[PDB]
Amino acid sequence: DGDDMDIPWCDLNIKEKIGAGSFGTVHRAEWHGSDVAVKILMEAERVNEFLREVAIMKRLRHPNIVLFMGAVTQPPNLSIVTEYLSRGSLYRLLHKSGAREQLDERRRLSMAYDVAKGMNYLHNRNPPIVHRDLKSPNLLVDKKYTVKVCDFGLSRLKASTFLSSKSAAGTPEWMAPEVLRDEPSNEKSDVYSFGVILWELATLQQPWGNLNPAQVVAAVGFKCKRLEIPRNLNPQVAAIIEGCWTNEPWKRPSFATIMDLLRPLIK
Amino acid sequence: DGDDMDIPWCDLNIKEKIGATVHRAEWHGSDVAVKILMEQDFHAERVNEFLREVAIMKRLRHPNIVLFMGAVTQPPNLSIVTEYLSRGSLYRLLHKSGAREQLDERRRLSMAYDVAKGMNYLHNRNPPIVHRDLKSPNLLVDKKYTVKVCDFGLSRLKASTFLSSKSAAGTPEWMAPEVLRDEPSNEKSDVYSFGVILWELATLQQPWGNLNPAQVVAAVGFKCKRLEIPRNLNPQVAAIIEGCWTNEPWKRPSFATIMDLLRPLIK
């Protein structure tokens, strides 16, 4: 056999750190001339869980998804190797230095189209795949400002009507109200998460940030609180955002539809 | 649990034709390119070659290699599905109206560097993969001017020092002397092909093109002839091109070395 997606840890020359998380650290590294990003785990049934995130990334092949390039399968330094996006997360990008001049309206909307295209790809796998944690921080930017979806660790396969485990994980500021209430959810929960991301690209603001997880669960989850949309916002853009936030998940548009509404907004 | 890379023909909404059969197509919202297998090519031997090409592309994951997205493996129209690159082939692009205006020196060198990265990735896979058909037409240009390698129909894995049971095949204008003569070839034969491609990017000239296939076999293969390098060409760029055209394949630089030479020339 051999799919050639197995990497020896000696073949990787680790470089400067680029991010941190509960799972472990992440560094930029050199791999046979190629520039890659390595996701090392903290030195547990999670070993079986790791193989899950690896087996699932191999099933993903789309231009708007972070390119999986292999993995180290030998402890203690397990790692997930992917391509390197030199512009970091869209989150840190939207709120850094001067982004008004760098990121004009057309560019920001385009970035949203990239996300929708990738998300649409996921929802159309067999079985479909729910990201369960779609947020600005989990979106990385290309040298040429192409946005790719990343961090599929909390991503589960949806073969049934709803999700199964009730793992109920994900960042509260971006999760859908039904998820915040810890009740049956589906692919429509991601659509809501996107609603927030579109809001960020459209208004250049940070969602909440004056509220802790508990306060978010309470407000947005059980008290029908939603992010404020400025009257100044493009009605067509606002319309797309409001659609993704509908209280009835089945009333929210699919990413396929979201693409159809965004395409004309560009140029 | 499944491969998720197998596609039914009815899931593809074929669009306009690209080259020749190749078509653009909408696949579950996504935008892909389709390499269809001809009707009369549907037999044991030919289909096996198809299966080999599919097997190889599953083993390729790199930003400068065209993204394999799936494959229809059911008659009729067994095809290979990849991402779509809207600017077409580098060939058509270099010989298009208002070329020099459209492509500055910096960009043209960057495209050369892109090819070098993807080719180094191939030769560094285990076992290494010799393209055996590297040329302008088999290089596709991304919307944002990113170059990627395509057409692995002739690509083979080199376990030994040379290709076992060498098969006479390829395109004359880009083929290395040893190849033209049906001799034991290696990864250094691709290096030669690259030199021609770089020569195209540097001069915007069509290689040969005043000669027929037989004249080329005679000229390059047996008469030690090479393409004419302009007088006004960058001496450092010319140095690279000449290095790739060494009579002895071993004296030619690896794609790893080529990258190191190009990187500085991009300021």
UniProtKB/Swiss-Prot annotation, chain B:
Effect of residue 53 to K: In ctr1-4; exhibits ethylene-treated phenotype
GO molecular function annotations of the record: ATP binding; protein serine kinase activity; protein serine/threonine kinase activity; protein serine/threonine/tyrosine kinase activity
UniProt keyword annotation of ATP-binding present: yes
Residues annotated as the enzyme's active site: 133 (proton acceptor)
Consequences of knocking out this gene: Mutants display ethylene-treated phenotypes, resulting in plants with small, unexpanded leaves and whose seed cotyledon growth is impaired.
Annotated effect of mutating residue 151 to E: In ctr1-1; exhibits ethylene-treated phenotype
GO biological process: ethylene-activated signaling pathway; gibberellin biosynthetic process; negative regulation of ethylene-activated signaling pathway; protein autophosphorylation; regulation of post-embryonic root development; regulation of stem cell division; regulation of timing of transition from vegetative to reproductive phase; response to ethylene
Domain of life, source organism: Eukaryota
Gene Ontology CC terms, in alphabetical order: endoplasmic reticulum membrane
Tissue-specificity statement: Expressed in both seedlings and adult plants.
Keyword entries, A-Z: ATP-binding, Ethylene signaling pathway, Kinase, Nucleotide-binding, Serine/threonine-protein kinase, Transferase
Domain Protein kinase: 12-266
Residues holding ATP: 35
Subunit structure: Interacts with EIN2 (via C-terminus).
Protein family (similarity comment): Belongs to the protein kinase superfamily. TKL Ser/Thr protein kinase family. RAF subfamily.
Function noted in UniProt: Acts as a negative regulator in the ethylene response pathway. Phosphorylates the cytosolic C-terminal domain of EIN2, preventing the signaling in the absence of ethylene. Interacts with C24:1-ceramide upon hypoxic conditions (e.g. submergences) to in turn regulate EIN2 endoplasmic reticulum (ER)-to-nucleus translocation and EIN3 stabilization.
Protein name: Serine/threonine-protein kinase CTR1
Taxonomic lineage of the native organism: Eukaryota, Viridiplantae, Streptophyta, Embryophyta, Tracheophyta
Gene: CTR1
Residues of the full protein shown: 540 to 810 of 821
